[PDB]
């Protein structure tokens, strides 16, 4: 909705 | 230098709109412009500055808290002192992540799964486990500060129920983070080029909710500390309100950054805001924990 | 997704050795591999982490020194307190530099001078002036610590001459940095694609020399503080030697990093070492300044 | 000799 993650990007 | 081209003598020529030709999984015909490549590179350069600031701040906060404390052996001290350590460990495995092949321009432009080895997936797993072991520490810190604010000579009706809603919010945040993590890991272990992201954008809203609740409860304590004193004959605060409200004795600045981080659309730096607000919350827990255990009307 | 290529089913296919085709100043025929591109990108990603750590550390050192000091109005305090501010200003204009067109993959691969505007050269100028206004503060701090160590009841032969060699070394370092800066600026203002670099690799050796001299003088003071006490009947240090020597009450760790930074060939991280050693020197000046003004035999 | 600067890289 507001944050989008890359396929290998972990949580921050 | 054999011979310069004629485009060297064109004042109005614009590099950046030129063409790059490369081979992808869709054949030897993919093309890109230099400004979309530079937009991919500038977001890695922007997400490494933040985590270097985080590592620096947290390391120099850990040492200073070790050296400038009178009353150790307190649980709140130990929890505040392991949250700053899990920030540094999270930032270490993200620098490890940022120089690996899962964040390369090679994988980004050419989505070949031969470039991903086993060892790149295990650091993703480990980082997703330290992120939930950091949210758990944040929530337990907030529930001990709430459990120390109202318990005492104050009325037991409000105090007993606010610990209940804070325990509830904390356990829900930790559980949702765990669920998100364990499904993302399943998905990634099945396919390296797969993304699962519906549960990360509600876990952040519940961390934000719990911090906003702690800010509300500290504002409540301040209004009742200005209301109780006037009833009696004791003298009021001279210029202590400005320190408490403005400086982060109450968690208002991280709460404002959190409410502008997800309300705004992603095209206005929404990713740069949650990363600053988690740092400011973990850095403001030592200051929110001194006001929380302070005499309401004895002093 | 019209159709996947056959190379998607090759286990031993290596992306990274593939070819990229682009147009440069030498025509529409330049080529590069993905690993030299990734080696250009990984050095920007490695030089942004260091300066974010620098900005974080220096900001959280400035505040803590403001809050944890008893004897203010001292010149050494003010000089130590403006060096931490010039570190943060230097790191700010370098983040400005790192996201500009002089550090882009576009300029790097295609050396077109149309991509460089006026405003990119003025931040280069400004950064080269803050670098010399930071070396000047470091040197004046070291010359006041030396001027406070030996001046007093101690013998006036050695003390009067060591301030002379330290004033000399400081003024030579500052002058050489100024010369380097003003010629680099002339060169760059003449041509954007020109590099002048013979005077930067001797200015670092003279900053390193001056720090090594301060470490020698503090070791001298320590050997004479262990030698004077035994002559009299006063009790010695119990476990103070380990703190002084090991922890940076004397500047031994920055001095070791400086002597391994330029002695080693550039292919072993020589640029990552001077940047850490300047941070550690500016962060260790508050600790070298407490030992320097301490009673040699009165206590 | 040991440190090399880029054409637009300022001093550090
Ligand atoms: C989001 C913002 C507020 C973060 C900024 C960084 C903070 C993590 C730093 C900056 C200033 C620091 C404070 C500066 C001075 C002090 C006083 C110091 O007091 C004592 O040593 C106690 C003395 C006594 O009890 O007699 C305790 C640490 C503390 C609160 C420091 C805790 C960490 C702080 C809040
Ligand atoms: C990844 C997790 C599971 C481990 C993280 C590191 C721990 C091994 C460290 C981090 C904080 C440490 C604690 C920080 C402070 C203290 C208080 C300290 O109190 C003292 O007896 C000395 C000070 C005093 O005299 O009051 C005793 C050790 C203890 C519990 C430390 C024990 C070791 C801890 C838990
Ligand atoms: C907070 C304090 C205690 C510092 C914590 C540092 C750790 C997060 C670092 C230090 C050493 C690192 C390890 C050093 C070497 C490797 C091998 C490395 O092997 C690879 O597959 C990549 C390199 C290659 O291709 O050979 C994988 C990561 C790993 C386990 C690193 C994981 C992250 C570690 C444990
Ligand atoms: C409390 C403060 C003083 C920090 C103390 C711990 C340090 C000794 C640790 C913390 C972070 C660590 C760093 C985290 C990550 C890396 C990247 C790592 O890189 C790799 O080997 C893999 C990636 C690559 O370089 O391609 C090498 C070790 C290093 C510099 C680590 C070296 C040891 C460091 C500085
Ligand atoms: C900070 C304190 C509490 C210590 C915890 C540090 C962890 C972040 C480190 C310690 C051991 C590390 C693990 C040690 C060995 C491996 C195997 C390694 O296997 C590989 O695929 C790479 C090597 C190979 O090719 O065999 C992957 C990383 C991993 C899980 C490491 C992940 C990071 C771990 C958990
Ligand atoms: C007791 C006081 C502190 C009030 C606390 C309220 C929160 C506990 C509740 C109220 C409304 C809830 C939200 C209402 C709707 C949504 C949208 C929902 O959308 C999704 O991302 C999931 C569905 C989808 O994938 O579309 C995620 C949960 C969330 C943010 C909820 C998260 C929890 C919230 C903020
Ligand atoms: C005690 C005080 C501090 C209140 C604590 C609770 C709030 C922090 C929660 C409760 C309900 C939440 C809201 C529930 C649902 C939504 C809708 C969600 O997506 C939308 O539908 C917005 C876009 C649109 O449809 O216009 C965005 C977050 C938002 C406003 C949430 C923002 C956070 C709110 C206000
Ligand atoms: C008590 C202390 C912590 C106060 C320090 C001030 C911060 C609250 C300010 C200073 C710089 C600000 C940032 C400056 C720039 C941006 C980019 C901005 O994104 C944009 O819309 C522009 C960039 C883009 O997205 O392309 C989002 C807010 C943010 C992170 C700002 C968030 C608030 C920050 C951290
Ligand atoms: C510790 C506290 C008290 C510091 C207080 C100062 C901050 C408010 C300053 C210091 C560094 C500043 C940042 C330094 C560099 C930039 C990049 C700058 O980027 C650009 O607009 C130029 C690059 C481009 O346009 O591509 C935007 C402002 C920002 C985030 C600045 C925002 C304001 C900051 C955080
Ligand atoms: C915190 C205290 C020490 C004050 C710090 C001030 C700096 C942040 C200022 C002072 C001088 C400024 C510089 C003065 C002149 C210019 C040229 C200016 O050139 C332009 O492109 C402007 C338009 C034009 O003239 O064509 C760009 C900004 C810059 C580098 C300024 C950047 C910001 C600087 C370094
Ligand atoms: C150290 C703390 C206390 C203050 C830090 C503030 C800086 C981060 C700010 C103040 C002045 C700013 C500068 C003011 C004006 C400009 C000109 C601006 O536009 C141009 O250079 C002209 C157009 C072009 O680039 O072609 C680019 C950003 C810049 C350098 C700004 C960059 C960020 C600066 C240095
Ligand atoms: C700590 C703060 C207060 C900054 C202190 C240093 C500034 C006063 C200096 C540093 C860089 C200087 C700038 C570097 C380069 C130039 C270009 C210069 O251009 C020319 O003289 C001719 C240009 C041409 O036609 O090619 C004019 C002054 C100016 C803006 C300088 C103005 C004064 C500046 C901002
Ligand atoms: C804060 C202290 C260190 C004083 C700083 C003074 C600055 C305002 C001075 C010092 C060096 C000067 C620069 C030295 C040399 C030149 C080259 C000069 O000549 C040209 O660029 C055109 C002719 C050519 O070189 O071909 C233009 C002015 C400029 C940038 C000067 C602009 C003003 C500067 C920055
Ligand atoms: C500490 C007191 C006793 C003063 C001792 C003097 C040294 C600090 C000086 C004297 C001679 C200097 C050297 C004279 C000439 C050179 C060559 C010079 O050559 C280069 O590498 C520059 C050009 C390039 O980058 O290729 C580098 C500095 C160096 C070793 C100088 C380093 C500093 C030295 C050793
Ligand atoms: C403890 C105090 C009193 C010592 C003060 C003197 C040193 C700071 C000076 C004296 C001799 C100098 C060295 C003399 C010659 C060289 C070789 C010069 O490079 C080379 O010619 C060799 C290159 C290589 O070996 O890779 C680089 C500077 C260096 C190490 C100089 C660095 C500065 C040194 C150590
Ligand atoms: C002052 C006290 C608190 C001790 C702090 C520890 C530092 C002195 C150590 C910890 C991590 C070390 C770094 C870990 C890894 C590297 C990469 C290493 O890289 C290489 O040699 C190969 C790759 C390349 O050529 O860059 C160079 C040294 C360096 C920066 C080390 C320099 C010394 C560091 C900063
Ligand atoms: C790259 O693809 C373009 C089509 O967008 C084509 O015109 C061109 O011939 C190809 N090769 C080079 C070197 O640009
Ligand atoms: C691109 O792919 C085709 C099919 O394999 C191949 O024949 C050709 O050599 C490649 N290059 C160009 C310029 O078409
Ligand atoms: C890229 O390199 C040369 C440049 O002309 C050319 O022979 C080759 O066919 C080009 N490859 C592609 C995919 O365009
Ligand atoms: C490259 O440059 C030549 C000379 O201008 C031009 O004729 C040609 O169209 C360009 N592209 C290719 C693929 O040769």
Author numbering:
A (entry chain K), D (entry chain I): 2 to 13
B (entry chain B), C (entry chain A): 5 to 303
Tell me, in the authors' exact words, what the paper reports:
Ste2 is a homodimer that can couple to two G proteins simultaneously and its dimer interface is formed by the N terminus, extracellular loop 1 (ECL1) and transmembrane helices H1 and H7. Here we determined structures of Saccharomyces cerevisiae Ste2 in the absence of G protein in two different conformations bound to the native agonist α-factor, bound to an antagonist and without ligand. Activation of Ste2 requires both the removal of a blockage from the G protein coupling site (H7) and formation of the binding site primarily through the inward movement of H6.
The antagonist is a mutated form of α-factor with Trp1 deleted and the W3A mutation added; conversion of Met12 to Nle does not affect signalling but makes the peptide more resistant to oxidation. The antagonist adopts the same hairpin shape as α-factor in the orthosteric binding pocket, but makes contacts with fewer residues in the receptor (20 compared with 32 in Ste2–Ag–G). The structure of the antagonist N terminus bound to Ste2 is linear, with His2 forming a hydrogen bond with Asn2055x29 on H5 and Ala3 interacting with Thr274ECL3 in ECL3. Upon antagonist binding, the side chains of Phe2045x28 flip inwards by 180˚ (7 Å inward shift of the Cα atom). Lys2025x26 has to flip in the opposite direction to prevent it clashing with the ligand, although there is only weak density for the side chain in Ste2–Ant because it extends into the detergent micelle. The intracellular end of H6 in Ste2–Ant is kinked outward away from the receptor core by 38˚ (12 Å shift at Cα Ser2436x35) compared with its position in Ste2–Ag–G, and this section is also rotated by 170° along the helix axis. By contrast, in Ste2–Ant, H7 is kinked in towards the receptor core at an angle that differs by 47° from the active state and the residues Ala2967x56–Ser3037x63 form a random coil. The position of the intracellular end of H7 in Ste2–Ant overlaps with the position of the α5 helix1 of the α-subunit Gpa1 in Ste2–Ag–G and thus sterically blocks G protein coupling. Notably, two putative sterol molecules reside at the kink in H7 in the inactive states of Ste2, but not in the active states; the sterol ergosterol is known to be important for Ste2 function.
